[PDB]
Amino acid sequence: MNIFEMLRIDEGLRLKIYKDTEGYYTIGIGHLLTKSPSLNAAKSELDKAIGRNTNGVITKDEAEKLFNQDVDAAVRGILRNAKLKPVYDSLDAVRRAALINMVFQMGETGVAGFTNSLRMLQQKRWDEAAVNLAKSRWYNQTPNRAKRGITTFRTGTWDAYKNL
Ligand SMILES: [Cl-]
Ligand SMILES: [Cl-]
Numbered sequence: 001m002n003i004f005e006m007l008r009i010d011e012g013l014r015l016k017i018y019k020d021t022e023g024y025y026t027i028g029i030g031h032l033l034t035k036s037p038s039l040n041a042a043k044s045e046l047d048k049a050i051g052r053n054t055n056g057v058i059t060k061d062e063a064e065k066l067f068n069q070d071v072d073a074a075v076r077g078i079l080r081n082a083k084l085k086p087v088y089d090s091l092d093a094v095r096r097a098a099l100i101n102m103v104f105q106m107g108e109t110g111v112a113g114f115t116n117s118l119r120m121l122q123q124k125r126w127d128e129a130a131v132n133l134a135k136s137r138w139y140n141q142t143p144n145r146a147k148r149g150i151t152t153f154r155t156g157t158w159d160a161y162k163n164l
């Protein structure tokens with residue numbers, strides 16, 4: 001298991017523009033296009049992202065290319081973030097993947113906001129961090145996904161994703 005396989009399980013793959021859990025236009029493997037309510041605005045962002053007149057539909061390879069870019073960006077946002085970097089550096093390989101997943105899902109800003117949980121993860125207080133992570137809009141709005149990430153931080157294994 002690795003970050004790519006992990007996120008692909010969590011986000012799925014869709015080749016036509018769709019609306020995410022928050023109702024925002026997205027495509028591919030969880031690639032957010034825009035927060036705007038306009039489909040045209042989404043189609044325009046899509047074309048700009050792909051480099052061609054897509055008409056709201058992309059191919060598998062194009063989906064994968066956005067994905068590779070998105071993971072890369074997530075990793076880079078963590079390393080440039082003063083609050084995130086130290087946490088990430090302190091963690092083992094499996095848990096690092098969980099942190100990338102959260103950033104990919106909620107942005108660097110969103111995660112950096114989990115001040116207390118981050119401090120607990122840095123301290124390696126797994127059970128405590130897991131309890132703190134659950135006290136969030138993130139867990140209440142997308143519980144199954146959040147549970148998978150929380151278990152990963154708790155155990156340091158890929159258990160929550162094997163079978164999926
Ligand atoms: Cl882009
Ligand atoms: Cl969920």
